[PDB]
Coordinates of C-alpha atoms and ligand atoms in Angstrom, one line a residue:
Chain A
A1 CA 27.9 -85.7 251.7
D2 CA 26.0 -82.6 252.9
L3 CA 26.9 -78.9 253.1
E4 CA 28.0 -78.9 256.8
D5 CA 30.3 -81.8 256.0
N6 CA 31.9 -80.4 252.8
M7 CA 32.1 -77.2 254.6
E8 CA 34.0 -78.7 257.6
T9 CA 36.2 -80.4 255.0
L10 CA 36.8 -77.1 253.4
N11 CA 37.6 -75.4 256.6
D12 CA 39.9 -78.1 258.0
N13 CA 42.1 -78.4 254.8
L14 CA 42.4 -74.6 254.8
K15 CA 44.0 -74.7 258.3
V16 CA 46.0 -77.8 257.1
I17 CA 47.5 -75.6 254.3
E18 CA 47.9 -72.7 256.7
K19 CA 50.0 -74.9 258.9
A20 CA 51.4 -76.9 255.9
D21 CA 55.2 -77.3 255.5
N22 CA 55.8 -79.2 252.2
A23 CA 54.2 -78.7 248.8
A24 CA 53.0 -82.2 249.1
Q25 CA 50.6 -81.4 252.0
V26 CA 49.1 -78.2 250.3
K27 CA 48.5 -80.1 247.1
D28 CA 46.6 -82.9 248.7
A29 CA 44.8 -80.4 251.1
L30 CA 43.7 -78.3 248.2
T31 CA 42.6 -81.4 246.4
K32 CA 40.3 -82.4 249.0
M33 CA 38.9 -78.8 249.0
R34 CA 38.1 -79.0 245.4
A35 CA 36.3 -82.4 246.1
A36 CA 34.4 -80.9 249.0
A37 CA 33.6 -77.7 247.1
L38 CA 32.4 -79.6 244.1
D39 CA 30.4 -81.5 246.3
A40 CA 28.9 -78.6 248.4
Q41 CA 27.8 -77.4 244.9
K42 CA 25.0 -79.7 244.3
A43 CA 23.6 -78.9 247.8
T44 CA 20.7 -76.4 248.6
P45 CA 21.5 -74.2 251.6
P46 CA 18.9 -73.8 254.4
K47 CA 18.3 -70.0 253.8
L48 CA 17.2 -71.0 250.2
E49 CA 15.0 -74.2 250.7
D50 CA 12.1 -72.1 250.0
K51 CA 13.6 -70.6 246.6
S52 CA 13.0 -72.5 243.4
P53 CA 16.1 -74.4 242.0
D54 CA 16.5 -71.8 239.2
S55 CA 16.2 -68.8 241.6
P56 CA 18.4 -65.8 241.1
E57 CA 19.8 -66.7 244.6
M58 CA 20.3 -70.4 243.9
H59 CA 22.2 -69.5 240.7
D60 CA 24.3 -66.9 242.5
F61 CA 24.9 -69.5 245.2
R62 CA 26.1 -72.0 242.5
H63 CA 28.2 -69.3 240.9
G64 CA 30.0 -68.7 244.1
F65 CA 31.3 -72.5 244.0
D66 CA 32.5 -71.9 240.3
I67 CA 34.5 -69.0 241.6
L68 CA 35.8 -71.1 244.6
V69 CA 36.6 -74.0 242.5
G70 CA 38.3 -71.8 239.9
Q71 CA 40.5 -70.3 242.6
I72 CA 41.5 -73.7 244.3
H73 CA 42.2 -74.9 240.8
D74 CA 44.8 -72.2 240.4
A75 CA 46.2 -72.5 243.9
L76 CA 46.6 -76.2 243.0
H77 CA 48.8 -75.3 240.0
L78 CA 51.1 -73.2 242.4
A79 CA 51.4 -76.1 244.6
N80 CA 52.2 -78.3 241.8
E81 CA 55.0 -75.6 240.9
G82 CA 56.5 -76.1 244.1
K83 CA 55.7 -72.6 245.2
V84 CA 54.2 -73.4 248.6
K85 CA 54.1 -69.9 249.9
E86 CA 52.3 -68.1 247.2
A87 CA 50.0 -71.2 247.1
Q88 CA 49.3 -70.7 250.7
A89 CA 48.6 -66.9 250.1
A90 CA 46.3 -68.2 247.2
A91 CA 44.5 -70.4 249.7
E92 CA 44.3 -67.5 252.3
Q93 CA 42.8 -65.1 249.8
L94 CA 40.3 -67.9 249.1
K95 CA 38.6 -66.9 252.3
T96 CA 37.3 -63.8 250.7
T97 CA 35.2 -66.0 248.6
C98 CA 34.1 -68.2 251.5
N99 CA 33.0 -65.2 253.4
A100 CA 31.2 -63.5 250.4
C101 CA 29.0 -66.4 250.2
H102 CA 28.3 -66.6 253.8
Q103 CA 26.9 -63.2 254.1
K104 CA 24.4 -63.8 251.4
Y105 CA 23.4 -67.3 252.3
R106 CA 24.5 -68.3 255.7
Chain B
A1 CA 25.8 -91.0 238.4
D2 CA 28.7 -92.9 236.7
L3 CA 31.0 -91.5 233.8
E4 CA 29.1 -93.0 230.9
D5 CA 26.0 -91.4 232.1
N6 CA 27.3 -87.8 232.6
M7 CA 29.3 -88.3 229.4
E8 CA 26.0 -89.1 227.7
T9 CA 24.5 -86.1 229.2
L10 CA 27.5 -84.1 228.2
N11 CA 27.3 -85.2 224.6
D12 CA 23.4 -84.9 224.4
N13 CA 23.2 -81.3 225.6
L14 CA 26.1 -80.4 223.3
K15 CA 24.0 -81.4 220.3
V16 CA 21.0 -79.8 221.9
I17 CA 23.1 -76.6 221.8
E18 CA 24.2 -77.0 218.3
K19 CA 20.6 -77.3 217.2
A20 CA 19.5 -74.8 219.8
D21 CA 17.3 -71.8 218.6
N22 CA 16.7 -69.6 221.7
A23 CA 19.1 -68.4 224.4
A24 CA 16.7 -70.2 226.9
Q25 CA 17.6 -73.6 225.5
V26 CA 21.4 -73.1 225.3
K27 CA 21.3 -71.9 228.9
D28 CA 19.4 -74.9 230.2
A29 CA 21.5 -77.2 228.2
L30 CA 24.9 -75.7 229.4
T31 CA 23.6 -75.8 232.9
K32 CA 23.0 -79.6 232.5
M33 CA 26.5 -80.0 231.1
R34 CA 27.9 -78.2 234.2
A35 CA 26.1 -80.7 236.5
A36 CA 27.3 -83.6 234.3
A37 CA 30.8 -82.3 234.2
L38 CA 31.0 -81.7 238.0
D39 CA 29.6 -85.2 238.5
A40 CA 31.9 -86.9 236.1
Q41 CA 34.6 -85.2 238.1
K42 CA 34.4 -87.4 241.3
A43 CA 34.5 -90.6 238.9
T44 CA 37.6 -92.7 238.3
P45 CA 37.9 -93.7 234.7
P46 CA 38.7 -97.2 233.5
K47 CA 42.2 -96.7 232.1
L48 CA 42.9 -95.3 235.5
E49 CA 41.6 -97.7 237.9
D50 CA 44.9 -99.2 238.7
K51 CA 46.5 -95.8 239.3
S52 CA 46.4 -94.3 242.8
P53 CA 43.9 -91.6 243.6
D54 CA 46.7 -89.0 243.9
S55 CA 48.4 -90.2 240.6
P56 CA 49.9 -87.6 238.1
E57 CA 47.2 -89.0 235.7
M58 CA 44.2 -88.9 238.1
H59 CA 45.3 -85.4 238.9
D60 CA 45.6 -84.3 235.2
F61 CA 42.2 -86.1 234.7
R62 CA 40.6 -83.9 237.3
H63 CA 42.3 -80.9 235.9
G64 CA 40.7 -81.4 232.6
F65 CA 37.3 -81.2 234.1
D66 CA 38.3 -77.9 235.9
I67 CA 39.1 -76.6 232.4
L68 CA 35.8 -78.1 231.0
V69 CA 33.8 -76.7 233.8
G70 CA 35.5 -73.2 233.6
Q71 CA 34.6 -73.0 229.9
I72 CA 30.9 -74.1 230.4
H73 CA 30.7 -71.4 233.0
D74 CA 31.8 -68.7 230.5
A75 CA 29.6 -70.1 227.8
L76 CA 26.9 -69.9 230.3
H77 CA 27.4 -66.3 230.9
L78 CA 27.2 -65.6 227.0
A79 CA 23.9 -67.5 226.9
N80 CA 22.7 -65.3 229.9
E81 CA 23.8 -62.2 227.8
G82 CA 21.5 -63.2 225.1
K83 CA 24.5 -64.0 222.8
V84 CA 23.2 -67.4 221.4
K85 CA 25.6 -67.6 218.6
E86 CA 28.9 -66.8 220.2
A87 CA 27.8 -69.1 223.2
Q88 CA 27.3 -71.8 220.6
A89 CA 30.7 -71.1 219.3
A90 CA 32.0 -71.4 222.9
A91 CA 30.2 -74.7 223.1
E92 CA 31.6 -75.9 219.9
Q93 CA 35.2 -75.0 220.9
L94 CA 34.6 -77.1 224.2
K95 CA 35.1 -80.1 222.2
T96 CA 38.8 -79.5 221.9
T97 CA 38.8 -80.1 225.7
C98 CA 36.6 -83.1 225.6
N99 CA 38.8 -84.7 222.8
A100 CA 42.0 -83.8 224.7
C101 CA 41.0 -85.9 227.7
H102 CA 39.7 -88.7 225.6
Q103 CA 43.0 -89.2 224.0
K104 CA 45.0 -89.4 227.2
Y105 CA 42.4 -91.3 229.3
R106 CA 39.6 -93.0 227.2
Chain C
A1 CA 49.7 -44.8 230.3
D2 CA 51.8 -45.6 233.4
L3 CA 51.1 -47.7 236.5
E4 CA 50.2 -44.8 238.7
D5 CA 47.6 -43.7 236.1
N6 CA 46.0 -47.1 235.4
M7 CA 46.1 -47.8 239.2
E8 CA 44.2 -44.5 239.8
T9 CA 41.6 -45.5 237.1
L10 CA 41.4 -48.9 238.7
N11 CA 40.6 -47.5 242.1
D12 CA 38.3 -44.8 240.8
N13 CA 36.0 -47.0 238.9
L14 CA 36.1 -49.3 241.8
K15 CA 34.4 -46.8 244.0
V16 CA 32.2 -45.9 241.0
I17 CA 30.9 -49.5 241.2
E18 CA 30.4 -49.3 244.9
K19 CA 28.3 -46.1 244.6
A20 CA 26.8 -47.5 241.4
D21 CA 23.2 -47.6 240.9
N22 CA 22.3 -49.2 237.5
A23 CA 23.9 -52.1 235.8
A24 CA 24.9 -49.8 232.8
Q25 CA 27.2 -47.9 235.1
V26 CA 28.9 -51.0 236.8
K27 CA 29.5 -52.4 233.2
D28 CA 31.0 -49.3 231.9
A29 CA 33.2 -48.9 235.1
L30 CA 34.5 -52.5 235.0
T31 CA 35.1 -52.1 231.3
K32 CA 37.5 -49.2 232.2
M33 CA 39.1 -51.4 234.9
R34 CA 39.8 -54.0 232.3
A35 CA 41.5 -51.4 230.1
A36 CA 43.4 -50.1 233.0
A37 CA 44.4 -53.5 234.2
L38 CA 45.5 -54.6 230.7
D39 CA 47.5 -51.5 230.5
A40 CA 49.0 -51.7 233.9
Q41 CA 50.1 -55.2 232.7
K42 CA 52.9 -54.2 230.5
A43 CA 54.5 -51.8 233.1
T44 CA 57.4 -52.5 235.3
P45 CA 56.8 -51.7 239.0
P46 CA 59.5 -49.7 240.8
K47 CA 60.4 -52.4 243.4
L48 CA 61.1 -54.5 240.4
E49 CA 63.1 -52.2 238.2
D50 CA 66.4 -54.0 239.1
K51 CA 64.9 -57.4 238.4
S52 CA 65.2 -58.9 234.9
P53 CA 62.2 -59.0 232.6
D54 CA 61.8 -62.7 233.0
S55 CA 62.3 -62.8 236.7
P56 CA 60.2 -65.0 239.1
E57 CA 58.8 -61.7 240.6
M58 CA 58.1 -60.0 237.2
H59 CA 56.3 -63.2 236.1
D60 CA 54.3 -63.4 239.5
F61 CA 53.6 -59.7 239.0
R62 CA 52.2 -60.4 235.5
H63 CA 50.3 -63.4 236.8
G64 CA 48.5 -61.1 239.4
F65 CA 47.0 -59.2 236.5
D66 CA 45.9 -62.3 234.8
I67 CA 44.0 -63.0 237.9
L68 CA 42.7 -59.6 238.3
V69 CA 41.7 -59.4 234.6
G70 CA 40.0 -62.7 234.6
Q71 CA 38.0 -61.5 237.7
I72 CA 36.9 -58.4 236.2
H73 CA 35.9 -60.2 233.0
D74 CA 33.5 -62.4 235.1
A75 CA 32.2 -59.5 237.1
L76 CA 31.5 -57.9 233.8
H77 CA 29.4 -60.8 232.7
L78 CA 27.3 -60.4 235.9
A79 CA 26.8 -56.8 235.0
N80 CA 25.6 -57.7 231.5
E81 CA 23.3 -60.2 233.1
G82 CA 21.7 -57.3 234.7
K83 CA 22.9 -58.7 238.2
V84 CA 24.0 -55.4 239.7
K85 CA 24.4 -56.5 243.3
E86 CA 26.4 -59.8 242.8
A87 CA 28.4 -57.8 240.3
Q88 CA 29.3 -55.3 243.0
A89 CA 30.1 -58.2 245.3
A90 CA 32.4 -59.6 242.5
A91 CA 34.1 -56.1 242.3
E92 CA 34.4 -55.9 246.2
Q93 CA 36.0 -59.2 246.3
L94 CA 38.5 -58.0 243.6
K95 CA 40.4 -56.0 246.1
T96 CA 41.7 -59.2 247.6
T97 CA 43.6 -59.5 244.4
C98 CA 44.6 -55.7 244.4
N99 CA 45.9 -56.1 247.9
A100 CA 47.8 -59.4 247.5
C101 CA 49.9 -57.8 244.6
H102 CA 50.6 -54.6 246.6
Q103 CA 52.2 -56.5 249.5
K104 CA 54.6 -58.3 247.3
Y105 CA 55.4 -55.4 245.0
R106 CA 54.2 -52.0 246.1
Chain D
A1 CA 52.6 -52.3 218.7
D2 CA 49.7 -52.8 216.1
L3 CA 47.7 -55.9 215.5
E4 CA 49.7 -57.2 212.6
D5 CA 52.8 -57.1 214.8
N6 CA 51.3 -58.7 218.0
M7 CA 49.8 -61.2 215.6
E8 CA 53.0 -62.0 214.0
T9 CA 54.4 -62.3 217.5
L10 CA 51.6 -64.6 218.4
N11 CA 52.1 -66.9 215.4
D12 CA 55.9 -67.0 215.7
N13 CA 56.0 -68.0 219.4
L14 CA 53.3 -70.5 218.7
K15 CA 55.6 -72.3 216.2
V16 CA 58.5 -72.0 218.6
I17 CA 56.4 -73.8 221.2
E18 CA 55.7 -76.5 218.6
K19 CA 59.4 -77.0 217.9
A20 CA 60.4 -76.2 221.5
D21 CA 62.5 -78.8 223.4
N22 CA 62.8 -77.5 227.0
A23 CA 60.2 -76.2 229.3
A24 CA 62.3 -73.1 229.6
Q25 CA 61.6 -72.2 225.9
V26 CA 57.8 -72.8 226.1
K27 CA 57.5 -70.7 229.1
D28 CA 59.4 -67.7 227.5
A29 CA 57.5 -68.1 224.2
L30 CA 54.0 -68.2 226.1
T31 CA 55.0 -65.2 228.0
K32 CA 55.6 -63.3 224.8
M33 CA 52.3 -64.5 223.5
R34 CA 50.7 -63.2 226.6
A35 CA 52.3 -59.8 226.0
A36 CA 51.4 -59.8 222.4
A37 CA 47.8 -60.9 223.2
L38 CA 47.2 -58.2 226.0
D39 CA 48.6 -55.7 223.5
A40 CA 46.4 -56.8 220.4
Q41 CA 43.7 -56.3 222.9
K42 CA 43.7 -52.4 222.7
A43 CA 43.7 -52.4 219.0
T44 CA 40.8 -51.9 216.6
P45 CA 40.5 -54.5 213.8
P46 CA 39.9 -53.2 210.1
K47 CA 36.7 -55.0 209.7
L48 CA 35.5 -53.1 212.6
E49 CA 36.8 -49.6 212.2
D50 CA 33.3 -48.3 211.4
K51 CA 31.7 -50.0 214.5
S52 CA 31.6 -47.9 217.7
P53 CA 34.1 -48.7 220.5
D54 CA 31.1 -50.3 222.6
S55 CA 29.7 -52.3 219.7
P56 CA 28.5 -55.9 220.2
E57 CA 31.4 -56.9 217.8
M58 CA 34.1 -54.8 219.5
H59 CA 33.0 -56.2 222.8
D60 CA 33.0 -59.8 221.4
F61 CA 36.4 -59.0 219.7
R62 CA 37.8 -58.1 223.2
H63 CA 36.2 -61.0 224.8
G64 CA 38.1 -63.3 222.4
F65 CA 41.5 -62.0 223.8
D66 CA 40.2 -62.6 227.4
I67 CA 39.7 -66.2 226.4
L68 CA 43.1 -66.4 224.7
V69 CA 44.9 -64.8 227.4
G70 CA 43.2 -67.0 230.0
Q71 CA 44.1 -70.1 228.1
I72 CA 47.8 -68.9 227.6
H73 CA 47.9 -68.2 231.4
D74 CA 47.1 -71.8 232.0
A75 CA 49.4 -73.1 229.4
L76 CA 52.1 -71.1 231.3
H77 CA 51.4 -72.9 234.4
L78 CA 51.8 -76.2 232.8
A79 CA 55.3 -75.1 231.5
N80 CA 56.1 -73.8 235.0
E81 CA 55.1 -77.4 236.3
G82 CA 57.7 -78.8 233.9
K83 CA 55.0 -80.4 231.9
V84 CA 56.3 -79.5 228.4
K85 CA 54.2 -81.9 226.3
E86 CA 50.8 -81.1 227.7
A87 CA 51.8 -77.3 227.7
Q88 CA 52.4 -77.8 223.9
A89 CA 49.0 -79.5 223.8
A90 CA 47.6 -76.5 225.6
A91 CA 49.3 -74.1 223.0
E92 CA 48.1 -76.2 220.0
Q93 CA 44.6 -76.1 221.3
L94 CA 44.8 -72.4 221.7
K95 CA 44.6 -72.2 217.8
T96 CA 40.8 -73.1 218.1
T97 CA 40.6 -69.7 219.8
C98 CA 42.7 -68.0 217.2
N99 CA 40.7 -69.2 214.4
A100 CA 37.4 -68.4 216.0
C101 CA 38.1 -64.8 216.1
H102 CA 39.5 -64.7 212.7
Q103 CA 36.4 -65.9 211.0
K104 CA 34.2 -63.4 212.7
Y105 CA 36.6 -60.4 212.4
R106 CA 39.6 -61.0 210.0
Ligands
HEM1 C1 37.1 -72.4 251.4 C2 36.0 -71.6 251.8 C3 35.1 -72.0 252.6 C4 35.1 -72.4 253.9 C5 36.5 -72.8 254.6 C6 33.7 -72.5 254.4 C7 33.7 -72.9 255.8 C8 32.5 -73.1 256.4 C9 32.2 -73.7 257.8 C10 33.4 -74.2 258.5 C11 30.9 -73.8 258.1 C12 30.4 -74.3 259.4 C13 29.0 -74.5 259.7 C14 28.5 -75.9 259.5 O1 28.6 -76.5 258.2 O2 28.1 -76.6 260.4 C15 30.3 -73.2 256.8 C16 28.9 -73.2 256.5 C17 28.3 -72.7 255.3 N1 28.9 -72.4 254.1 FE1 30.8 -72.1 253.9 N2 32.8 -72.3 253.6 C18 33.5 -71.8 252.4 C19 32.9 -71.6 251.1 C20 31.5 -71.3 251.0 C21 30.9 -70.9 249.7 C22 31.6 -70.5 248.5 C23 29.5 -70.8 250.0 C24 28.6 -70.5 249.0 C25 28.4 -70.8 247.7 C26 29.4 -71.4 251.4 C27 28.1 -71.6 251.9 C28 28.0 -72.1 253.3 C29 26.6 -72.4 253.7 C30 25.4 -72.3 253.1 C31 26.7 -72.8 255.1 C32 25.8 -73.2 256.0 C33 25.8 -74.8 256.1 C34 24.7 -75.3 257.1 O3 23.6 -75.4 257.0 O4 25.3 -75.7 258.2 N3 30.6 -71.7 252.0 N4 31.2 -72.8 255.9
HEM2 C1 31.7 -81.6 226.7 C2 32.7 -82.5 226.5 C3 32.6 -84.0 226.6 C4 31.8 -84.7 225.9 C5 30.7 -84.1 224.9 C6 32.1 -86.1 226.2 C7 31.4 -87.1 225.7 C8 31.6 -88.5 225.8 C9 30.8 -89.6 225.3 C10 29.7 -89.4 224.4 C11 31.3 -90.6 225.8 C12 30.6 -92.0 225.5 C13 31.0 -93.4 225.9 C14 30.3 -93.7 227.2 O1 30.4 -93.1 228.1 O2 29.6 -94.8 227.2 C15 32.5 -90.3 226.6 C16 33.3 -91.2 227.4 C17 34.3 -90.8 228.2 N1 34.8 -89.5 228.4 FE1 33.9 -87.9 227.5 N2 33.0 -86.2 227.0 C18 33.6 -84.9 227.3 C19 34.6 -84.5 228.0 C20 35.3 -85.3 228.9 C21 36.6 -85.0 229.6 C22 36.9 -83.5 230.0 C23 37.0 -86.0 230.2 C24 38.2 -86.2 231.0 C25 38.4 -85.3 232.1 C26 36.3 -87.2 229.7 C27 36.5 -88.4 229.9 C28 35.7 -89.6 229.3 C29 36.1 -90.9 229.7 C30 37.2 -91.4 230.7 C31 35.3 -91.7 228.9 C32 35.0 -93.1 229.1 C33 33.8 -93.5 230.0 C34 33.4 -95.0 230.1 O3 34.1 -95.7 230.8 O4 32.6 -95.3 229.3 N3 35.2 -86.7 228.8 N4 32.7 -89.0 226.7
HEM3 C1 41.5 -53.4 241.2 C2 42.5 -53.5 242.0 C3 43.5 -52.6 242.2 C4 43.4 -51.3 242.6 C5 42.0 -50.6 242.8 C6 44.6 -50.6 242.8 C7 44.8 -49.4 243.1 C8 46.1 -48.9 243.3 C9 46.2 -47.3 243.7 C10 45.0 -46.4 244.0 C11 47.5 -47.1 243.7 C12 47.9 -45.7 244.2 C13 49.3 -45.1 244.1 C14 49.7 -44.4 242.8 O1 49.6 -45.3 241.7 O2 50.1 -43.3 242.7 C15 48.3 -48.4 243.4 C16 49.5 -48.6 243.2 C17 50.1 -49.8 242.7 N1 49.5 -50.8 242.4 FE1 47.5 -51.3 242.4 N2 45.6 -51.6 242.3 C18 45.0 -52.8 242.0 C19 45.6 -53.9 241.6 C20 46.9 -54.1 241.5 C21 47.6 -55.3 241.1 C22 46.8 -56.7 240.7 C23 48.9 -55.0 241.1 C24 50.0 -56.1 240.7 C25 49.8 -56.9 239.7 C26 49.1 -53.8 241.5 C27 50.3 -53.1 241.6 C28 50.5 -51.8 242.0 C29 51.9 -51.1 242.1 C30 53.3 -51.8 241.7 C31 51.7 -50.0 242.6 C32 52.7 -48.9 242.7 C33 52.6 -47.9 241.5 C34 53.5 -46.7 241.7 O3 54.7 -46.8 241.3 O4 53.0 -45.5 242.0 N3 48.0 -53.2 241.8 N4 47.3 -49.4 243.2
HEM4 C1 47.5 -67.4 219.4 C2 46.4 -67.1 218.5 C3 46.5 -66.2 217.3 C4 47.6 -66.4 216.5 C5 48.7 -67.3 216.3 C6 47.1 -65.4 215.5 C7 47.9 -65.1 214.3 C8 47.6 -64.2 213.3 C9 48.6 -63.9 212.2 C10 49.8 -64.7 211.9 C11 47.9 -63.0 211.5 C12 48.6 -62.4 210.2 C13 48.2 -61.2 209.2 C14 48.8 -59.9 209.7 O1 48.6 -59.5 210.9 O2 49.5 -59.3 208.9 C15 46.7 -62.6 212.2 C16 45.8 -61.5 211.9 C17 44.7 -61.2 212.6 N1 44.3 -61.8 213.8 FE1 45.1 -63.1 214.7 N2 46.0 -64.7 215.8 C18 45.7 -65.2 217.0 C19 44.6 -64.9 217.7 C20 43.6 -63.7 217.4 C21 42.5 -63.4 218.2 C22 42.1 -64.0 219.6 C23 41.9 -62.4 217.5 C24 40.6 -61.8 217.9 C25 40.3 -61.3 219.2 C26 42.6 -62.1 216.3 C27 42.4 -61.3 215.4 C28 43.1 -60.9 214.2 C29 42.9 -60.0 213.2 C30 41.8 -59.0 213.4 C31 43.8 -60.0 212.4 C32 43.9 -59.1 211.2 C33 45.0 -58.1 211.4 C34 45.3 -57.0 210.2 O3 44.6 -56.2 210.2 O4 46.4 -57.5 209.6 N3 43.7 -63.0 216.2 N4 46.5 -63.3 213.3
ZN5 ZN1 47.3 -68.8 237.8
ZN6 ZN1 33.4 -64.5 229.1
ZN7 ZN1 30.8 -66.3 236.6
ZN8 ZN1 44.8 -75.3 234.8

């Protein structure tokens, strides 16, 4: 899908996690986020459609996703360890990464 | 693309890296590997077409990519730091991850 | 050294990075933070001096550092790639990790 | 402690993990390895006592530990998820990292 969609996914499951009750939910949600993130990856953001594919910006843009995915990956682990609360914390702190990118490229 | 393709990509650039001379090459090759890995991600391997999307296996399968991608990501950094040799080492040691997955799901 | 010290180090270089001008500075500062974090690691926080060494808390406490170190490591890479700005961003976003631990154990 | 010691620690718990039966053991052992690794970190290897602290080698040397610790961190997660076998696999594959450093600096 396109950015807007994967981003909608990202934001939806994030709220699902915040309202989540069981570790089952959190896991599934995070899993979708990973997918959404990995997909958002390939995309080229509007503010950067004039920049070349191998631009310092496009590279930093892609780097952001590697950070985001790495984080989800870990939060995932926590959910898998049954630790629902600290997994949610992990998800909440993800926002820092979401935001970060938004300033630079949204 | 489909697994076979992204896997071909993955294996080709790996050898490109082993035969690589300049940091420029390694970078580019690793970059391609990231793309191939991230894509291979979405795919569902043959040995697991009967297993549900949220199977312990399908999840572990996906996890391997997170490891692989993470590793490529760091190798990438090394290449960007001009450190061609240790980046190649990083690439060589990636194999451990490639193999790992192959036993369980290839 | 002891927590307070390594923590002071951590917070000092963090501001050094924020006021940093050249990539050389950022690198050096981040390098100090790595050392400081790696050291703070071994330590046992006050709120947890009654808890056993292998407590869920002492483990989570240790995990936080693994996250922090991991992040510093990557920020370091960026600095080495000459990318001073996104390296600073990487540092700023570290705080999320700093904070996270402080709620739970400070 | 000094390198030799942390290294002994590292190699001992590794074998403990290989002979390990319950997830409890694996966790505890890996935890010791982390401590041993993080400590080995600060040290200055013999082959590099003539090189300056900020040498390309001393830096690469330190980087190796960041890789090792990172890996241990993940194995740790697997143990915590009860997955004793794949955690042991994680541990076995760590050796690739152990070796790597030994060629360059042992
Ligand atoms: C889990 C974290 C994240 C969440 C929940 C999130 C959420 C959102 C949401 C809800 C939008 C709404 C606007 C729309 O698409 O119509 C948006 C847009 C956007 N996000 Fe994020 N985001 C996250 C991470 C990131 C990261 C890491 C990057 C950069 C690498 C990024 C780049 C963008 C961009 C470029 C847009 C503009 C899309 C457009 O053209 O409409 N986001 N984000
Ligand atoms: C850089 C590391 C890797 C390399 C170089 C690599 C390479 C290859 C190659 C050359 C094939 C050839 C057979 C073909 O596709 O026709 C293959 C197949 C396969 N690989 Fe990898 N691989 C890597 C990592 C991984 C990882 C991490 C996983 C698991 C998460 C994985 C899963 C598979 C599977 C399931 C197949 C079978 C594909 C098919 O149906 O043909 N690989 N791989
Ligand atoms: C780069 C991020 C971090 C910065 C800049 C930072 C900074 C600080 C500072 C300035 C103090 C001042 C109080 C003092 O020590 O006298 C402090 C205390 C403390 N920090 Fe951090 N911290 C960071 C990360 C962390 C992390 C990840 C943990 C947990 C694993 C942690 C645990 C603590 C604890 C337990 C104290 C109390 C120390 C005491 O007994 O005085 N910090 N931190
Ligand atoms: C878990 C993986 C590792 C294991 C099990 C391991 C194990 C060992 C063992 C058993 C020795 C025995 C010699 C002695 O100390 O008397 C040794 C030496 C050494 N290892 Fe490792 N090691 C590991 C990782 C590393 C890494 C990542 C580095 C580099 C960053 C490294 C650097 C060294 C060095 C420099 C020595 C020489 C110490 C001396 O002066 O005696 N090792 N290692
Ligand atoms: Zn973790
Ligand atoms: Zn690295
Ligand atoms: Zn990075
Ligand atoms: Zn993992």
